[model samples]
Target: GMTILSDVKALGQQIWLDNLSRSLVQSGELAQMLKQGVCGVTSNPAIFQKAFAGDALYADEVAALKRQNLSPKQRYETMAVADVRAACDVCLAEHESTGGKTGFVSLEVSPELAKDAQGTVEEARRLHAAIARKNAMIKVPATDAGIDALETLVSDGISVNLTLLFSRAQTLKAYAAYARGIAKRLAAGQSVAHIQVVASFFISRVDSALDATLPDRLKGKTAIALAKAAYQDWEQYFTAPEFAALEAQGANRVQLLWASTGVKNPAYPDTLYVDSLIGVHTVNTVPDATLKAFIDHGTAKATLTESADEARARLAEIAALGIDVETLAARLQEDGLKQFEEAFEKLLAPLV
Candidate 1:
């Protein structure tokens, strides 16, 4: 009674799953999801790393691999790669069907590489090659180093699903890096038509970061305002005459994907952020519940965020509070990584 992923796709949004495990592939849920019009799959170290541990579905694989003396981390790769390969395969038929938009799975590099550009780049190339799936997307954090690595990856024709974006500024930077990469690819005579990137701007986390300080009148404004701002930036970027040249050369614009859309504050409606932020050329990775909630009682609206002045007014209100919004956003991103890492460790511990 709860499969509303199509409702999401109907609103010009891409419906993607947030949770992934080896079981998803083995249990057939992942394939079922794709056939249901689930357009993409996302993973993180914390996600796949934990999927390596507690999921009973991986128990047999773990037991067999233990005989080979693989470390827990090595075991993680073994399992995650299998599921990624499987997820990639599921997406493959979709890839051919959709011309490469629907069948991609993301595998994130260690969060520890968030600050290492060269390290991130090396790992990105290595992982992209390791996965060996045309549907594979290497996920990187939205750190400065990640930006540097992303530029290189795009130039080399490596696709990316940028994860952990917290602020409009971070997304703007991602857009810039993608733009630079496209230009680099063009200069190097590379084919820009086939490469893709998605700037995964997070949703509810922004409210959690700023809501406490925001006036009561400003409640729950963080994520939507941020989405509006990112779109504004996208406006300034893709519309520029210089970028038109790149577009003419077959470079694709980086689309703003709304990540972490699950509502963090119980006081707010489960579908608040999702309902408010729908637009074209955007991807919203809703957890299963949010997807169902929207299908049951959600309103689909354009909110194309064309009214920049109204959006900036809200951001201005937040800025008046003297919060270093950017600093808080980065801090939240770091905290999120730590939280995921801990969850994965708990799941991995055999004692449980």
Candidate 2:
């Protein structure tokens, strides 16, 4: 695989796998990924939906569980926990190697409960404890409620992987929440060491939502522009005196995780997204197809972390053009939530 995973590592970036499945774990595919430079793993409802539906590994177990008393959510967990637990073990060697810096795996709570702050917090802690793995990140939606849940969970020393982040506002909010959570953890006499958090910002989906609204020149700039702007917030937050204090207390700063990076528009270059978003302390999760494309021909450059002033201006220009990005981001997040919800439904059903 000539993927940016190799490129990411070479450039001091992290490459995470966006997929998870019991079969992959049972078959030792996840361990192979760790050996191949996959430092982390991320999972969502859509991925699990595909995993459970398309694989025969969970059928008999699900059927037997159906005979017993189990909620759909509980059943879903029964199917997913096996994968998460197995993946954690496969990456254990790397987790040890990195001393818990990378080699982490993320398992999301139910999208159905994305709006429930208490539920998300409870679910995350329960899941993390269930697996008993130090590297697990409880996926949160970045919604107001989900943000609340994120802070609560993170305060209790649970690493968070914030998802559905589409705009600077959402990204910054996630960071602030993470920082505050870490600060609270320190305040409450918790050890902030080995706690890693990443804000998962979806890329190609931004273009998917705004491409038709922009002129040809701006068609492909939305995603990169948004990424650049978010980096601005990241740099500012981590560099401030207060944040530096938290970092000194062993608070693991939230890093950027580039998500939904697969090429969507046929007219755009296949490796365009991967080539564009690069910087240190960031992770990029790519699918099998896109990873292959980048391995073949993706270019590497320092496309991230340079103040993001131009990106801010570009975002202003986009807003001046009457795009109402705030609305778009909100709408897209809602739609994205539904998409994942459906996929989770699919993942839990039999593959056949």
Candidate 3:
């Protein structure tokens, strides 16, 4: 049966499920989604916390892990790694068929290491090894430290999902780091074909954070405008002459993955983020509710590049109103990390 999700895929934007769990994988629902056009999966500390707390399929393994002599963090990793590996298997065919362009499952490094470059790298490596699948992507925050770690991971040929990005500046930093990594790999005479990357720029959170302080005209416009501008930046950077050589050698440009896509405000349309940001060479990871809503009543088209001039003007208008988006982006990144950290702590509390 034809659906809007598949139409989105046909237009070059990959739809990824922003949630994952043992139940999602084992019940065959995830496999079913693959048929419906979901090509990737992404999980975070909060997602695992929800899954471990609510999913019955995890009960048996939880009890077993609790009985073992492992640290709480260790126990969490044990369950998460298994879930990620299963998801990778479920999506393996898409991965293979795309030649590593899609069909990825993202597992983030411990939130506690968000600011520690060395620690993030070490944990990412360990988790990547534990997942033991070519389709698995280690997600790192777009923090300063995380960006530092990103270059190294890319040079090592590890696929990555750089998350928590809000502003075009942050997204550009991620792109530069990725380019440097690709350059290093090519300079070292290594094949760049297998390394995949996505800069997961958040969407609704920007609007959520600033909506209250804005006039009604600009209430829900900031996030979409920012995303459109970032998409423009992505096209300019990756298609520049400097990146052509790398592209010619099988290196993939870091695709923009829209994260935090679920609408937080009740007044906004449920599929607002997904609908407004559809474009080619990008990914949108939507929560279950948003996904269902889009499948039911969404419009699929190349809306991402539409009205670029208006987007730029809206951003300028926002700045004229004394709202500094860059400052807010920094705060949002910090707050996002903190929320994930709290979720991680809570996830470990029961095990301890």
Candidate 4:
């Protein structure tokens, strides 16, 4: 039952809700989820498009913003900032109880700025300051430009959730940037205690991108193997002297978050991603569909590192299929940006 969700927590993985609507927060549904062991919330342009355009939940706010003569971009930012503030409020208790480890609500700047490093940094700063919530995390993409923005944002002592991550190479780059940011902060005599960050490795999408090309035996297996490999990389760096030194000073060296975890193909079990990736100090953000499925029939355990060698072998098999995972990741990042742009356009249609 509900205890099953708690079981994932017991195994050291935080379950964060991947959807947010005004009603979800206003009706106390989010709070109830928190009580049921959901430790955080994540949002995106697509999620907001569904939430804001799905109904009249934001009609009054939209109308008010219109009256204020704000442009559609400004109006959208106002609405998003408010929703994040509410989510942050709902998760406040969990945030405090965990001593700033979890219970964060992520808000993203425009994905249109995916390739604009300076724009992303300015917008992230603006949104972070506007939300004014200690538990608020500015979601930044892992585009090449975003890599630079993340380093600057981290050094500024801003909490961040680095999103749109795809490959092991990208994961390494993110960790290096995060470490650089933290190292800079420490050098400036800044406090790293409240510096929160997570490298959001998208799951399921990798399978969605590669499943059809793989043989039946490996159809749905690659994404989990990739996630497990990334987790191993996390174990290597965080325990090494560099991050261990920062950990000595209260820097939570970027936790790994499994994103895009909802099962898309009806053929696969709904809880496949969540159940397969549970481990200590990691996170899995699930949409309502997958969250409900897991609560109903999910099995929880520390499966992330159980068969280390086999996971590496799977990557080799994937490469043998003549697929360069790094190249695929770059394409997926571009595809993700396109999707985000389309969602944002849909989100702004009614406003205009």
Report the Cα lDDT for residue 213, model 3.
88
lDDT for each residue of candidate 2 in 1-352, tens digit (9 for 90 to 100): 4454666787767878788877878888778778777788888888877777777887787887788787777888877887788888888888888778888888888888889998888888999998888877888898989888877887788888989988778777777888888888788898888778888998999898888878877888888888887877788888899899998887777899899999899989998877788888889988877767877788777777644777777788888899877788888899999998888777555422
lDDT of 1 at 247: 91
TM-score against native, each model: 0.92, 0.94, 0.99, 0.98
User: Residues 1-352, candidate 4, lDDT per residue (tens digit)?
Assistant: 7898788888989999999888899998999889989999999999999999775778898888888877788888888899999999999999999889889999988988988999999999999999999999999999889989999999988999999898888888988998999989888889999988999999988999988778988889999999999999999988999889998987887899999999987779999999899999999999998998998999988999889899999999988989898998888888998999999999897887
Q: After superposition, how far is residue 119 of candidate 3 from its true place, in Å?
A: 1.0
- State the lDDT at 63 in candidate 3: 92
lDDT by candidate, in order shown? 0.79, 0.82, 0.93, 0.91
- Clash totals for all models, in order? 0, 4, 0, 0
Name the TM-score of candidate 1: 0.92
Model 2, residue 306: distance off in Å is 6.6
Output the worst ten-in-a-row residue range by lDDT, candidate 1. 343-352
Rank ordering of all candidates by lDDT, starting from the highest:
3, 4, 2, 1
lDDT of 4 at 309: 93
Tens digits of per-residue lDDT, candidate 3, 282-322, equal: 99999999988998888998999999999999999999999
TM-score: the better of candidates 1 and 3: 3
| Residue pairs with backbone atoms closer than 3 Å in model 3 (clashes) | none
Error of 1 at 40 (Å): 0.6
* Model 1: how far residue 16 lies from native, Å: 0.8
The per-prediction CA RMSD against the true structure, in angstroms, equals 2.3, 2.1, 0.9, 0.9
